[PDB]
Amino acid sequence: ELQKLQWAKQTTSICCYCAVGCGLIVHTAKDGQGRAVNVEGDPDHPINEGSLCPKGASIFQLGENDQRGTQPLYRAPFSDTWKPVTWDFALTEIAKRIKKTRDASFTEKNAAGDLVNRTEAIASFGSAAMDNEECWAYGNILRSLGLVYIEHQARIXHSPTVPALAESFGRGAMTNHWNDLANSDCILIMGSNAAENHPIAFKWVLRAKDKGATLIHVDPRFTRTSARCDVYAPIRSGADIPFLGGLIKYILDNKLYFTDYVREYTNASLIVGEKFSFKDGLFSGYDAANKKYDKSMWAFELDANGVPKRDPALKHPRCVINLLKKHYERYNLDKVAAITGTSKEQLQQVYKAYAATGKPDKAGTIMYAMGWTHSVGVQNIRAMAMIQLLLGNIGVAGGGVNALRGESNVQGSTDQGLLAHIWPGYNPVPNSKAATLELYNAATPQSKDPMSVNWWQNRPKYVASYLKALYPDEEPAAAYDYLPRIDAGRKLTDYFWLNIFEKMDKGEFKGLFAWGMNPACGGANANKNRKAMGKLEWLVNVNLFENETSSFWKGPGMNPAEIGTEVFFLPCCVSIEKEGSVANSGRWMQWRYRGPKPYAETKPDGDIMLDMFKKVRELYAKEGGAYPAPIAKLNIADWEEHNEFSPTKVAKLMNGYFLKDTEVGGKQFKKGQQVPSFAFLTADGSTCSGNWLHAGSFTDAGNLMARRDKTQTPEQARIGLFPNWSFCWPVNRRILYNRASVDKTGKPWNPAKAVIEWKDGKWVGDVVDGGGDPGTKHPFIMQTHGFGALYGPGREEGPFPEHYEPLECPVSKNPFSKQLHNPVAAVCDPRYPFIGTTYRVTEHWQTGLMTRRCAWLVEAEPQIFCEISKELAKLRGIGNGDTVKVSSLRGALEAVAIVTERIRPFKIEGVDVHMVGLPWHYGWMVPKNGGDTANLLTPSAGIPETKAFMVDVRKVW
Amino acid sequence: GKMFFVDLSRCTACRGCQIACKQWKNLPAEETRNTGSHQNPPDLSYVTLKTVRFTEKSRKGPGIDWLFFPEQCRHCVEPPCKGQADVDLEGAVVKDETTGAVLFTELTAKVDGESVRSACPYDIPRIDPVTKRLSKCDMCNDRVQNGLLPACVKTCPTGTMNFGDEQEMLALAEKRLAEVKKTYPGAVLGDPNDVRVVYLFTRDPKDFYEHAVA
């Protein structure tokens, strides 16, 4: 027996870092009574199989860390130091600041006289790190208090990805999952450094290669990913759309598209209206004065029924496919090569390798994470989705757009609507014009096409069931009035990440929740944001350690004596000190358990937020105040067991249960029973559900998220579905759009890697994405018209991706049109001639708040560095390892020079343009000589710009 | 006996192995600084039993050959460190007959720490400036005896690290060298008759590290 593990209780957990969702086994001393003694990988877990990258591998050092917060800390206005205080004091004083600010700023009716019932004087940031049950509860607590400025991590990836993939496929999520990468014949990694940023993903990338696959890395830098690919192709920053535009033309010119797939499952056949045109880099319906488009000009030609007209012959010149062919004729190899900086040879190589997956028995996948996805980032991902629809790689094993999520639960936190524009289940936040529940539900487009499922028509069941979970004693129509509404007249982006920092700097916020985020390092233009936080009356920071956000008031250049911001620092417990679920990139909602009890006096986020809310509710019950109803009637009794936050009970409420005896889909359901699927939710108040996507996750059969069953059929095991390991939304459909993986008979395109198959009156393999017999329904059930969208007339920049230059300063020429920059959209001060970029290394996490406190990770990567080419090193007289000053209009910092051939000068319009690489993992707080955030350098000018900002790099003597 | 097969053609330099070694044994972190490399710690020492070495070699056209070497004791079949150590005191360095692990005991304080490092053709052993004891990779003999994989082997996600009986590992190395040669035609196995840590190199082992082979 191993002594270290002998006598310790053994529990399972999920990694608290990236969205791969690696299994841990935790060993806890005194049969679970004491501290953690060991943390390592779960050998039975089918994603990581015991493997951990150094972040997961170091989780013992994260949890059992004597630098961690022990109890709440208080900082009085202008105070020079922290004052240790009790929970009772901190939550009580916090509950009073909330009420004071709410009562003083709560507006029942906006200027226009419409009901909004909201506060614009309190903002909240975070968090993708919290459990799914804690994210859901947090969102509802903030909305019951009437907040509309509710944001977190997800914003930076959401704004590009979700609208791109939603427009294309009808959902915004990663189409496939990690294990499925192993089934791919060609893996295109472009806008991703997966080897460093999703390391366990490369288990499955390399296994794809073992079974014959070509691995292609498209990156301005040579990384640890590049080292383990068959093809490294350098690309100039922001030349992605040219590159993908060339691939579209290559596929159409060489007839490499999957014809039958395209004719049946994409909108290739649909007739676009006569009002559509493109000329000189502008689509039809352009308002030159306002710099935006009239998208009605891009409408389809509708038949008598109101269904878009189709030519299955694909002969009509206004067929999507024919307009697509016309549009991308301009992206010839010579033009694309010149702008990308990629040799015609390599382009032809990459194009040939990947477009070979257009074969029905071949599958290609594209992996992107953040990359550089600016003005036309949405259109970049649109082009990836369009390539995949052309080659019929959507819905199949080894296919899909694998949009890699960042944080462990950024998928879950987004699903729980911790963004300003969405409630849970991606039901929009009502605007001022949505005066009643009937009007809110009126906005859902209908289809007269009988083959079109148009699943979003069920939205009224989900909204009603949602309001019955929050306010179960009220009519949904009545409860609808409790939750705040945004201004219909204002830009949606005015409620988002970047404008919350703008408003803060204009002192328009009394309060901020920094809940599981480090804005003082995370936010672009750190100098501005750190000064802007001084203009807050109170700040609530909930994190594991003291950090640059909590302690901004004693930061570099700051004078505590003249900063009046009142800070409460509440220390939360680590991931292994609590029970709950995290939803990975693949939508796997994975249950994890408590190992050690919370360290010192730390609490789970659920207990902090629930206790904080109860004290707010108490004050309103005794004092009264502004519109108490939403706060008073919110059902928090379902969240609680044994006087504590219950992950189990919140998860059951999120799945949902019947509030009475109900007949649904011609099947009798008893009162109190768990809802077994979102198909059996109702609009009439019979059912409740916190999130319709969770309906199926916690049934009468039990907690399916806690399943650790590796049982697989041969056809399931061949592609690694593992459908009995945990649970993925929707209803355990592991590969989305899987109806596209079979013909109108129900026979797979690729029988050797079948996802579903029609055998003896049933779909066999994965859960079918949309009920119905073969060839009776269009495969994209969340789309209105039911088709994969090559033509996307809902995008602001036009229905086809078009190259507009995102890299302003060093580029004057667009070889594809007259239109240089985005027509619906930087100083370029010559003192800063270099392109600054920020990116990650394997060993550090986000702002480094967590990993800078883990000695083994600091050991590997102790200091901020500046990676530069040999060419820039020669120009500026810099030697490998020299200290340099990197500067911009926004600030300056010192870092160690790493001179490397992994960085090469960009060739732009006959000039060498040098790119400067910085990690954003560092902050003044810790460690000694670690350095400060690279966001000192980044500009503000609703997503920040972190991949291309102008810098100078000087040697320091 | 047991053997490590290390397929460096699969290594992503994630350094999971480096961290996992220190987690299992609860070793401390060295004081490090960046001197123009991701490589840290820069060398093995008393408290670092495994480090990943980074080496960049220029190649024709875009990118580089980025060579990664997670360095550990080779656990030699005929240990030269034992032979040299046994000239001062027999016991300081012993060979486990079950696993084939070369193990430095607490009696390595008594022997000449300098010359027993010199005898090692891989320059593995490291001396404590205090207790004067030798430390290195102990093959996680603790775990191997209990039918578990070594920490560095279990943590590795790429399939670089492989562990098991000498016969089935040499069988794997031969079959893997055959498939790796199709991508890296200059691929070779390091000292596959003399050691129990068999490194597959994509090219000249000397490019990965000076003491990569005997």
Ligand SMILES: Nc1nc2c(c(=O)[nH]1)N[C@H]1C(S)=C(S)[C@@H](COP(=O)(O)OP(=O)(O)OC[C@H]3O[C@@H](n4cnc5c(=O)[nH]c(N)nc54)[C@H](O)[C@@H]3O)O[C@H]1N2
């Ligand atoms: N180790 C580690 N892993 C992480 C994180 C972390 O901090 N550390 N954070 C997580 C989060 S929040 C996220 S969103 C993900 C992000 O994961 P990634 O998107 O992989 O993150 P980055 O390293 O910032 O960017 C990936 C690559 O994009 C390249 N790139 C830069 N500009 C361009 C361009 O114009 N075009 C193209 N094609 N490529 C370009 C960079 O050179 C870099 O190699 O990682 C997650 N995982």
Ligand SMILES: Nc1nc2c(c(=O)[nH]1)N[C@H]1C(S)=C(S)[C@@H](COP(=O)(O)OP(=O)(O)OC[C@H]3O[C@@H](n4cnc5c(=O)[nH]c(N)nc54)[C@H](O)[C@@H]3O)O[C@H]1N2
């Ligand atoms: N220059 C530059 N800036 C960037 C980026 C970039 O690439 N370059 N990336 C951007 C992106 S993609 C993102 S997502 C953001 C991320 O920016 P942030 O989210 O602000 O960064 P961190 O705070 O480091 O993220 C992890 C946080 O979660 C906390 N945490 C962990 N577990 C828990 C828990 O159980 N409860 C609570 N309450 N907190 C917990 C950690 O302590 C830590 O504070 O940064 C953005 N900023």
Ligand code: SF4
């Ligand atoms: S950081 Fe990501 S890849 Fe590494 S162990 Fe954790 S979940 Fe797995």
Ligand code: SF4
């Ligand atoms: S590698 Fe060196 S220290 Fe290890 S067994 Fe061989 S001779 Fe001894």
Ligand code: SF4
């Ligand atoms: S075998 Fe064990 S002791 Fe040796 S390097 Fe690997 S983890 Fe460390």
Ligand code: SF4
């Ligand atoms: S864990 Fe595996 S892939 Fe990562 S550095 Fe170690 S040997 Fe290489």
Ligand SMILES: [S]
């Ligand atoms: S993220």
Ligand SMILES: [W+6]
């Ligand atoms: W992110």
